[PDB]
Design an enzyme around this catalytic site. Structure first.
Site, mmCIF file in Angstrom:
data_model
loop_
_atom_site.group_PDB
_atom_site.id
_atom_site.type_symbol
_atom_site.label_atom_id
_atom_site.label_comp_id
_atom_site.label_asym_id
_atom_site.label_seq_id
_atom_site.Cartn_x
_atom_site.Cartn_y
_atom_site.Cartn_z
ATOM 1 N N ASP A 43 0.701 -1.385 -0.080
ATOM 2 C CA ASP A 43 0.187 -0.010 0.084
ATOM 3 C C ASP A 43 0.926 1.240 0.042
ATOM 4 O O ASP A 43 1.309 1.589 0.991
ATOM 5 C CB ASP A 43 -1.006 -0.082 1.223
ATOM 6 C CG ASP A 43 -2.310 0.754 1.439
ATOM 7 O OD1 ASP A 43 -2.286 1.769 0.675
ATOM 8 O OD2 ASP A 43 -2.855 0.580 2.546
ATOM 9 N N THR A 44 0.858 2.212 -1.222
ATOM 10 C CA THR A 44 1.513 3.230 -1.078
ATOM 11 C C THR A 44 0.778 4.456 -0.418
ATOM 12 O O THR A 44 1.291 5.555 -0.265
ATOM 13 C CB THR A 44 1.848 3.733 -2.506
ATOM 14 O OG1 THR A 44 0.259 3.999 -3.348
ATOM 15 C CG2 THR A 44 2.496 3.025 -3.155
ATOM 16 N N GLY A 45 -0.470 4.292 -0.043
ATOM 17 C CA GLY A 45 -1.292 5.082 0.674
ATOM 18 C C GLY A 45 -1.268 4.914 2.299
ATOM 19 O O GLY A 45 -1.679 5.610 2.956
HETATM 20 C C1 LIG Z 1 -0.161 7.831 11.646
HETATM 21 O O1 LIG Z 1 -0.866 8.474 10.770
HETATM 22 C C2 LIG Z 1 -1.887 7.913 9.817
HETATM 23 O O2 LIG Z 1 -2.233 6.576 10.721
HETATM 24 C C3 LIG Z 1 -1.847 7.866 8.435
HETATM 25 N N1 LIG Z 1 -2.935 6.896 7.927
HETATM 26 C C4 LIG Z 1 -2.413 6.087 7.074
HETATM 27 O O3 LIG Z 1 -1.326 6.037 6.534
HETATM 28 C C5 LIG Z 1 -3.468 4.895 6.696
HETATM 29 N N2 LIG Z 1 -3.597 5.063 5.369
HETATM 30 C C6 LIG Z 1 -4.790 4.966 4.791
HETATM 31 O O4 LIG Z 1 -5.902 4.777 5.554
HETATM 32 C C7 LIG Z 1 -5.100 5.323 3.349
HETATM 33 C C8 LIG Z 1 -6.069 4.119 2.968
HETATM 34 C C9 LIG Z 1 -5.693 2.745 2.976
HETATM 35 O O5 LIG Z 1 -4.930 2.525 1.601
HETATM 36 C C10 LIG Z 1 -6.709 1.843 2.750
HETATM 37 C C11 LIG Z 1 -6.358 0.378 2.968
HETATM 38 C C12 LIG Z 1 -7.212 -0.533 3.158
HETATM 39 C C13 LIG Z 1 -7.609 -1.506 2.190
HETATM 40 C C14 LIG Z 1 -8.693 -2.434 2.406
HETATM 41 C C15 LIG Z 1 -9.250 -2.419 3.528
HETATM 42 C C16 LIG Z 1 -8.738 -1.786 4.600
HETATM 43 C C17 LIG Z 1 -8.005 -0.629 4.351
HETATM 44 N N3 LIG Z 1 -7.842 1.779 1.718
HETATM 45 C C18 LIG Z 1 -8.845 2.228 1.850
HETATM 46 O O6 LIG Z 1 -9.097 2.733 2.962
HETATM 47 C C19 LIG Z 1 -9.520 2.496 0.407
HETATM 48 C C20 LIG Z 1 -10.351 3.670 0.447
HETATM 49 N N4 LIG Z 1 -10.817 1.420 0.877
HETATM 50 C C21 LIG Z 1 -11.034 0.727 -0.328
HETATM 51 O O7 LIG Z 1 -10.719 0.830 -1.300
HETATM 52 C C22 LIG Z 1 -12.314 -0.315 -0.194
HETATM 53 C C23 LIG Z 1 -11.516 -1.721 0.628
HETATM 54 N N5 LIG Z 1 -12.751 -0.815 -1.146
HETATM 55 C C24 LIG Z 1 -2.781 3.584 7.105
HETATM 56 C C25 LIG Z 1 -2.934 3.648 8.783
HETATM 57 C C26 LIG Z 1 -3.684 2.321 6.734
HETATM 58 C C27 LIG Z 1 -2.709 9.094 8.166
HETATM 59 C C28 LIG Z 1 -2.820 9.405 6.679
HETATM 60 C C29 LIG Z 1 -3.778 9.424 8.929
#
Ligand SMILES: COC(=O)[C@@H](NC(=O)[C@@H](NC(=O)CC[C@H](O)[C@H](Cc1ccccc1)NC(=O)[C@H](C)NC(=O)[C@H](C)N)C(C)C)C(C)C
Lengths: 99, 99
Positions: A25-27
């Site tokens: 995951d790049t996100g």
């Molecule tokens: C420490 O700081 C943080 O916590 C930062 N957060 C992040 O970097 C967070 N990034 C993220 O939260 C970025 C989003 C992730 O890529 C998730 C991954 C996922 C896929 C499938 C199921 C569940 C989750 N994708 C999704 O939520 C996408 C919209 N969901 C889907 O595509 C659905 C499954 N069809 C990670 C913690 C996961 C900040 C950007 C808030």
């Protein structure tokens, strides 16, 4: 290894000997995993996204073998619907997004 | 372009003329954005993320201009903490995750 992304980039990683399926995951800033217990020394941490935040247990110096490489890195354990290998491990593997 | 992943792969996009900061996300199957107005001919969809599900408004065939390419695709509107461009738009751009 090239992921065209027409399907989720999932791969098998061995985290301290356990096989685990993982999404590249790049996100994701961090790597969160469920289902493997890494032990008693960790830091409670919190990570958030769509939906809200969850509590995680952060581990350091975790031994992982993914894509033919062995790297040591930080993994978080926690209530996650899917195991994620975030940017911190993708940089350690020299992976890049390209256009 | 190549996005190594030492920092978040955030880019600027124009969704029906409207600019928005967007994260290119290989862990997202869908694209969700917020703060952009769209054509009230949307269909309610639900989108799951880390720790939860949010209510979304799905718009089909939205015209997008990103990374110098003009593209069309389904984008979901919702109260997302990060504007996400998932795999449906990444494949359309011709992006790949490479090792
Ligand atoms: C420490 O700081 C943080 O916590 C930062 N957060 C992040 O970097 C967070 N990034 C993220 O939260 C970025 C989003 C992730 O890529 C998730 C991954 C996922 C896929 C499938 C199921 C569940 C989750 N994708 C999704 O939520 C996408 C919209 N969901 C889907 O595509 C659905 C499954 N069809 C990670 C913690 C996961 C900040 C950007 C808030």
């Amino acid at each position: 290894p090239q992921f065209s992304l027409w399907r989720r980039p999932v791969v098998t990683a061995h985290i301290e000997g356990q096989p685990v399926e993982v999404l590249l995951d790049t996100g994701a800033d961090d790597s969160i995993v469920t289902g493997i217990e890494l032990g008693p020394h960790y830091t409670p941490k919190i990570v958030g996204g769509i939906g809200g935040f969850i509590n995680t247990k952060e581990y350091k110096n975790v031994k992982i073998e993914v894509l033919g490489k062995r790297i040591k890195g930080t993994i978080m354990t926690g209530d996650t619907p899917i195991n994620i290998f975030g940017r911190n491990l993708l940089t350690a593997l020299g992976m890049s997004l390209n256009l």
